[PDB]
Design an enzyme around this catalytic site. Structure first.
Site, PDB file in Angstrom:
ATOM      1  N   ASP A 333     -54.269 -19.184  -4.272  1.00 52.56           N
ATOM      2  CA  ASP A 333     -55.372 -20.009  -4.749  1.00 52.56           C
ATOM      3  C   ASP A 333     -56.695 -19.300  -5.118  1.00 52.56           C
ATOM      4  OD1 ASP A 333     -53.916 -22.464  -4.774  1.00 52.56           O
ATOM      5  OD2 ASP A 333     -54.428 -22.893  -2.671  1.00 52.56           O
ATOM      6  N   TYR A 418     -54.581 -30.233  -3.540  1.00 51.36           N
ATOM      7  CA  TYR A 418     -55.091 -29.871  -2.212  1.00 51.36           C
ATOM      8  C   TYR A 418     -56.543 -30.171  -2.105  1.00 51.36           C
ATOM      9  N   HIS A 467     -43.501 -26.596   2.367  1.00 50.02           N
ATOM     10  CA  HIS A 467     -44.358 -25.459   2.056  1.00 50.02           C
ATOM     11  C   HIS A 467     -45.102 -25.007   3.327  1.00 50.02           C
ATOM     12  CE1 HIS A 467     -46.911 -28.993   1.880  1.00 50.02           C
ATOM     13  NE2 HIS A 467     -47.912 -28.192   2.182  1.00 50.02           N
ATOM     14  N   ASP A 476     -66.451  -9.559  10.237  1.00 54.33           N
ATOM     15  CA  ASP A 476     -67.136  -8.318  10.526  1.00 54.33           C
ATOM     16  C   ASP A 476     -68.165  -8.557  11.587  1.00 54.33           C
ATOM     17  OD1 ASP A 476     -68.372  -5.853  10.678  1.00 54.33           O
ATOM     18  OD2 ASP A 476     -69.256  -6.056   8.661  1.00 54.33           O
TER      19      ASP A 476
HETATM   20 CA   LIG Z   1     -68.420  -4.186  12.578  1.00 58.69          CA
HETATM   21 CU   LIG Z   2     -49.416 -29.213   3.022  1.00 57.44          CU
END
Ligand SMILES: [Ca+2]
Ligand SMILES: [Cu+2]
Ligand SMILES: *[C@@H]1O[C@H](CO)[C@@H](O[C@@H]2O[C@H](CO)[C@@H](O[C@@H]3O[C@H](CO)[C@@H](O)[C@H](O)[C@@H]3O)[C@H](O)[C@H]2NC(C)=O)[C@H](O)[C@H]1NC(C)=O
Ligand SMILES: *[C@@H]1O[C@H](CO)[C@@H](O[C@@H]2O[C@H](CO)[C@@H](O[C@H]3O[C@H](CO)[C@@H](O)[C@H](O)[C@@H]3O)[C@H](O)[C@H]2NC(C)=O)[C@H](O)[C@H]1NC(C)=O
Ligand SMILES: CC(C)Nc1cc(=O)n(-c2ccccc2)nc1-c1nc[nH]n1
Ligand SMILES: CC(C)Nc1cc(=O)n(-c2ccccc2)nc1-c1nc[nH]n1
Ligand SMILES: CC(=O)N[C@@H]1[C@@H](O)[C@H](O)[C@@H](CO)O[C@H]1O
Ligand SMILES: *[C@@H]1O[C@H](CO)[C@@H](O)[C@H](O)[C@H]1NC(C)=O
Ligand SMILES: *[C@@H]1O[C@H](CO)[C@@H](O)[C@H](O)[C@H]1NC(C)=O
Ligand SMILES: *[C@@H]1O[C@H](CO)[C@@H](O)[C@H](O)[C@H]1NC(C)=O
Ligand SMILES: *[C@@H]1O[C@H](CO)[C@@H](O)[C@H](O)[C@H]1NC(C)=O
Ligand SMILES: *[C@@H]1O[C@H](CO)[C@@H](O)[C@H](O)[C@H]1NC(C)=O
Ligand SMILES: *[C@H]1O[C@H](CO)[C@@H](O)[C@H](O)[C@H]1NC(C)=O
Ligand SMILES: OC[C@H]1O[C@H](O)[C@@H](O)[C@@H](O)[C@@H]1O
Ligand SMILES: [Ca+2]
Ligand SMILES: [Ca+2]
Ligand SMILES: [Ca+2]
Ligand SMILES: [Cu+2]
Lengths: 709, 706
Positions: A333, A418, A467, A476
């Protein structure tokens, strides 16, 4: 100290300014993206280029001057003897004056032209070849099965997956569906599926290379008529009107008494200003990549930064089925774009009524900035739980607790069927919860044959195809500084003799601590042993001598990754892992790439490259999390898949990072001894909500940020 | 009906009247009782039999008799036992009826009986008046000893000895901290008290622990101290910062977000029945097993006969005897018995409905725990569902999840457990439990770090696991259920339209599990991704009407089987198990297991025994837990965030389409409409704002145990 807003997305001015800069020196025959042909030169996207970290931190922490605000542009160069996509950096905003090609720097050569996403135009050129030069060759059949007139458009196409079977291919299976009105076309497939090849730069040269009708494969729409006419095709008649969930979305029930409403009795307790949010405990910037999707930067709990960046990287959907579309559909996506496809948040439905909502700006497949209205909401939620509490009947005779109230930031990408909800939620305890729901409609196939292995019947003629959903996030952390270590703690029972009764045995509960020193030691594949306590920590320690840590606990029922034997799996290598930890890097900004989807056999980014045994002992570390789950659709996914239990993600949890629970100091905490009046305003704030605190605001009049035309 | 309603105060009184006249003298109030006495420990509802209750609920039959169950301590006799006596019928009992042998097969060994309050009282007398003074010397230099130990306090531990028959409890010592948690102030000293004798006067102290060393008596300890062979350090008995306090220093700011019901509450509560537009059920509290709900119906149709808490289990590591040998089975004390008032605004939303709860435990009069339950409706700030379409057709439809919620909290020593049942309008049910309150700490004497973290000055935060056990009596479309397991797989196959190319073909994988042990899933082994109980009644699309169990648990490795204790909580070894429902298997554990898990009064693994589960009345058992290695952020309390565990019960082809589609609260509009028009869209309408306010009731609190 450093007070700049260098994580913010580009304003309209900023976007315009960059467009004007580019127009001027791309030159002979720059076409607007929104009508570009394959052989044209085109500006695909313009958006923020993120700053380098070293400079960003110097600025924010050590008062240095901020780095140059730049923008990155994707240019399709089709009007040449050897077309290419190019990535161009342009700054310095707000009044740019330079432009740099960073394509070969970032990729090691030119970007092959077929990697490029399919343009709105390309979709239209295809749909003409379909509805004008092709379906016509089968009006006999279509008049019969599918209510087709002249050409007319009562049907509708939808795209898929990779496009082909090989690096270089550009050939998409398109399903056909009744254009339903005011509700979801995805449930009404008509059993027709065309394999359109569209590699060529001349749309005239575009062939259809296979057909699939209602269980059977033909070589063209000619053969298909031939046979239908020759009475040689048993044809299933699928309606185009109906009632209920498979047809409508409008509840036929009148409004009853009102749902509960949440208000901030004496003003809100946070504030948003630009890309920046600040509250008494929390401080962060929030953004939105065109293709990556949502992101927050520079998160700080009581002044102290925990994470430089947390950001969506990719979203994946892997299908099975009876029928060549779904059996071959692996959506990456990002190659459409979770930002590009972000949608307005309906006030009172997608966020609480009194949330604060915030527009997003972009220039994609266009030549002027546009805006999605109310793309983000930020709000403080009262969770209905306590964060902590203790009632003491034993010895004395006191109560002490605090009701959990929490701070949320949401955006929703709506791609095809979706509706992905992305949440980040900030807890008073110093924890951060990332959540990802999937709602909206369900992609379906026409129900025909051996169903049970490929999903459930959910409406008449309608197979809910099986699916897997998976999402990747970059986390981070910079735990009390850049230099981090990762630790794995768990339990073990060691059988021993009771020290004071050696006849007898006991099972000795022990803690186990292991230090993960190399990238591979912290790379955990799906369905593998995962340490109950995994955290990154500092060389520094807290007041009791333990390392200052943030624990990553996952919430994933991950499906089963596409097998590595699959020649296309390199295009989403991150699916193989639950969790990995890697040395942070300027050359490894992302997990994925908008160019991965249309050539996953030759990936622009192969996330597995980041794991390349290097030390993670005391460096700048970044943790990559995958969350996801298998979806076998069923009747209650009609009209829409529902969010309940579909929530998936992770916590970031403080582990000996503080010296005590920060919430000890909350202004909101409550306490009273047995010997006091708890219905006394001076003993207890809650005693004086009724008289005479707060009187429920007048509400903004409803409004909505509308639709793309 | 008022068929699963816990006993009224009036009913409880009337059973005690009966038991009194019909057990004649002497028979003592259990708040006074010594071991050698006769004693009503507890009187609570005897839940009726399912058959007869469904009869009455589904077929106008008259109601099964309403019976109490009294647990009685028969100490005044050559052969002392505990007896389970059924009494009835209510509201005016005529009969009574020992069922002990019928259920257990013998009598109940008297050493399985829970430690009474008096027992604790006496155990303290002995320690504080006849034992600690022998070490008043050391305890002066250790920890401010005085008059006569009014500065110190004890806390029980786990099972009470090392084999069947024992009644020897390790107790730690702690500062009697005022208005905050003593649990964080282990003074370094642990005593193994032996209180098995029926004569409290014959009570020894088998062992003593101080700073990593074991002695045989307090006298032998005070000796070595006086001989200068024991390095004492003076432990501070006050301080600052929530090691020492719960009160925040920071003064209160602008208020947090308040929820209210603009046009009144959308559910009702009469007695123990909750009714709403979508959900209807009954709720209550087992004195020992805790919270439970019955006859849960969604839009009139029953989904579950019963969901209940069975047991709660904490298992420790440690440097010290008290900790290293502690496996609490908190049912032994009782989640119902130890349920606490809910502080309005903190434990539940200010505007919840709060219900009282009545009990007759270790006394002769009924009493109330006020505000013991809360029921409320809660806006989640999340869409239940939503789609915004920009492609081919411009519309929006979606709905914000509001949710219906029932809660109580059990406070057991240091723990505050939160028991949540949440009812979603998708037709799903979600069960959650949360561990909060204080941790337990040991005194820190170096060589720790296999057993926890230093977490405060002088305190070790002791490693442990938590676990809880739920009984789930799903009657999916009537009683006869089967169990299915489905999952996924990848199958290499040539690509039809291009056979030269390969392709990983994703397929569903289904399987019927006919026999009990096919559907018993141990911790550590893997589980099918989809797992549900089906009827043979199919839905409109030809699929077995289902209800899927989906588990939210991070369960810690369970006490190994090798342990002679384990059979006292064999459920810990399972994530999930499904079983034939049986009247003789009402509970997954028992109040009597705590004090003798080596001879377990109920052993859960007995229920799994190679029967069929194809087409019978099934009941599912769910175990949820986590490993808890304490850390600084657990000071003062452990917070809820990330510590929720439980499971979802989710419709799986149970309906023909999502019920929320018929929601009174759904929102829809196409782009060609005026989304700001009140009759295109009910959000563009204004109900009574300002004008003025939600009207809030005067705050009050349940109080304390007096
Ligand atoms: Ca880091
Ligand atoms: Cu689904
Ligand atoms: C991908 O396509 C771009 C655009 O076609 C290529 O960049 C272009 O390269 C030419 C020379 O190869 C540049 O020419 C330069 O300016 C003038 C013409 O305007 C020319 O006479 C000079 O000799 C000078 O080289 C052209 O400006 C440049 N365009 C841009 C926008 O950068 C690029 O090389 C291709 N990428 C790869 C990796 O091959
Ligand atoms: C556990 O202890 C129980 C009480 O001590 C005991 O119940 C009592 O049982 C005795 C006989 O076992 C009954 O006493 C009756 O004895 C004469 C015979 O001479 C009868 O004619 C009278 O009915 C007289 O009351 C008690 O009635 C009975 N009390 C109750 C409340 O049940 C249990 O039998 C013991 N349980 C086990 C398993 O041993
Ligand atoms: C208005 C016209 C350009 N149609 C489209 C718009 C569009 O945004 N998409 C699209 C393509 C991929 C993901 C989500 C949407 N597809 C189509 C599309 N799909 C098949 N045909 N056209
Ligand atoms: C005042 C007297 C009745 N003391 C007690 C009451 C009490 O309810 N407990 C208790 C024991 C185990 C779990 C929860 C509470 N312990 C005690 C106790 N524990 C050690 N000494 N006393
Ligand atoms: C790619 C490879 O050979 N693996 C190396 C290993 O041989 C070496 O001893 C180690 C030293 O840090 O680094 C890694
Ligand atoms: C489909 O129907 C909508 C409204 O229901 C109409 O406005 C639109 O143009 C149609 N689109 C097609 C047939 O592609
Ligand atoms: C602990 O402190 C409280 C304060 O009033 C007191 O009443 C209580 O009796 C003390 N506990 C003990 C065991 O001395
Ligand atoms: C489902 O099976 C049970 C079990 O014997 C039977 O009584 C019931 O009528 C069945 N119904 C259908 C529709 O198969
Ligand atoms: C558990 O089981 C065995 C039985 O032989 C016991 O001796 C030991 O404590 C444990 N060891 C292993 C390897 O399972
Ligand atoms: C238990 O398993 C045996 C196989 O030896 C099977 O024949 C029998 O039907 C089962 N018995 C029970 C307890 O139902
Ligand atoms: C630990 O690690 C590095 C050297 O490898 C050092 O520079 C850092 O300051 C250290 N932290 C300590 C000893 O607390
Ligand atoms: O309480 C016991 C008492 O009641 C019983 O029913 C009788 O059988 C008497 O013999 C006996 O004294
Ligand atoms: Ca690397
Ligand atoms: Ca059942
Ligand atoms: Ca059985
Ligand atoms: Cu714990």
């Amino acid at each position: 100290p450093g007070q700049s807003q260098l994580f913010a997305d580009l304003s309209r001015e900023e976007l315009t300014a960059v467009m004007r800069f580019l127009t001027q020196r791309l030159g002979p025959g720059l076409v607007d993206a929104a009508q570009a042909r394959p052989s044209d030169n085109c500006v695909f996207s313009v958006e923020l280029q993120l700053p380098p970290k070293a400079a960003a931190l110097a600025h924010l922490d050590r008062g240095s001057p901020p780095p140059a605000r730049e923008a990155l542009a994707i240019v399709f160069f089709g009007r040449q003897p050897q077309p290419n996509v190019s990535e161009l950096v342009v700054g310095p905003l707000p009044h740019p004056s330079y432009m740099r090609d960073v394509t070969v720097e970032r990729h090691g050569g030119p970007l092959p032209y077929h990697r490029r996403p399919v343009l709105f135009q390309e979709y239209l050129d295809i749909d003409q070849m379909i509805f004008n030069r092709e379906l016509p060759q089968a009006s006999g059949l279509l008049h019969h099965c599918c209510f087709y007139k002249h050409r007319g458009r009562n049907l509708v196409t939808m795209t898929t997956a990779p496009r082909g079977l090989q690096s270089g291919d550009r050939a998409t299976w398109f399903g056909l569906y009744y254009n339903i009105s005011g509700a979801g076309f995805f449930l009404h497939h008509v059993g027709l599926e065309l394999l359109v090849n569209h590699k060529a730069l001349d749309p005239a040269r575009w062939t259809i290379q296979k057909v699939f009708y209602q269980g059977r494969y033909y070589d063209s729409l000619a053969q298909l008529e031939a046979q239908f006419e020759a009475g040689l095709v048993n044809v299933v008649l699928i309606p185009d009107n109906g009632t209920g969930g498979s047809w409508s979305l409008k509840s036929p029930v009148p409004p009853g008494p009102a749902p509960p409403l949440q208000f901030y009795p004496q003003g809100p307790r946070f504030s948003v200003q630009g890309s920046r949010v600040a509250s008494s405990l929390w401080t962060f910037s929030f953004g939105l990549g065109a293709f990556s999707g949502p992101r927050i930067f520079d998160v700080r709990f009581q002044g102290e930064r925990l994470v430089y960046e947390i950001s969506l990287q990719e979203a994946l959907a892997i299908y099975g089925g009876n029928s060549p579309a779904a059996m071959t559909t692996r959506y990456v996506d990002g190659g459409f774009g979770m930002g590009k496809y972000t949608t307005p948040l309906t006030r009172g439905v997608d966020c609480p009524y009194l949330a604060t909502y915030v527009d997003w700006h972009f220039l994609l497949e266009s030549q002027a900035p546009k805006t999605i209205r109310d793309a983000f909401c930020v709000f403080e939620q009262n969770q209905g739980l306590p964060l902590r509490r203790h009632h003491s009947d034993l010895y004395s005779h006191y109560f002490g607790g605090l009701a959990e109230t929490v701070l949320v930031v949401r955006s929703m990408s709506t791609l095809l069927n979706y509706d992905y909800v992305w949440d980040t939620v900030f807890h008073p305890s110093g924890a951060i919860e990332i959540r990802f729901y999937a709602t909206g409609y369900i992609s379906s196939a026409f129900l025909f044959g051996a169903t049970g292995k490929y999903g459930n019947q959910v409406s008449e003629h309608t197979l809910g195809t099986v699916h897997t959903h998976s999402a990747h996030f970059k986390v981070d952390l910079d735990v009390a500084g850049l230099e981090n270590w990762v630790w794995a703690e768990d339990m073990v029972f060691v059988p021993m003799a009771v020290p004071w009764s050696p006849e007898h045995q006991l099972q000795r509960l022990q803690v186990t601590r292991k230090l993960l020193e190399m990238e591979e030691q912290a790379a955990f594949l799906v369905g593998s042993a995962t340490p109950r306590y995994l955290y990154l920590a500092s060389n520094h320690s807290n007041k009791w001598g333990h390392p200052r840590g943030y624990r990553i606990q996952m919430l994933s029922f991950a499906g089963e990754p596409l097998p590595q034997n699959s020649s296309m799996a390199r295009g989403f290598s991150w699916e193989r892992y639950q969790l990995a930890v890697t040395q942070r890097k300027e050359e490894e900004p992302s997990s994925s790439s908008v160019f991965n989807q249309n050539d996953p056999w030759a990936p622009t980014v192969d996330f597995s490259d980041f794991i390349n045994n290097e030390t993670i002992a005391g460096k700048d570390l970044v943790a990559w999390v995958t969350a996801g789950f298998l979806h076998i659709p069923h009747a209650e996914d009609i009209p829409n898949t529902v969010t309940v239990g579909n929530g998936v993600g992770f916590f970031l949890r403080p582990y000996n990072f503080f010296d005590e629970d920060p919430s000890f100091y909350s202004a909101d905490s409550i306490y009273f001894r047995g010997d006091q009046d708890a219905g006394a305003c001076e003993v207890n704030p809650l005693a004086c909500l009724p008289q005479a605190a707060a009187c429920a605001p007048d509400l903004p009049a409803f409004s909505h940020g509308g639709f793309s035309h």
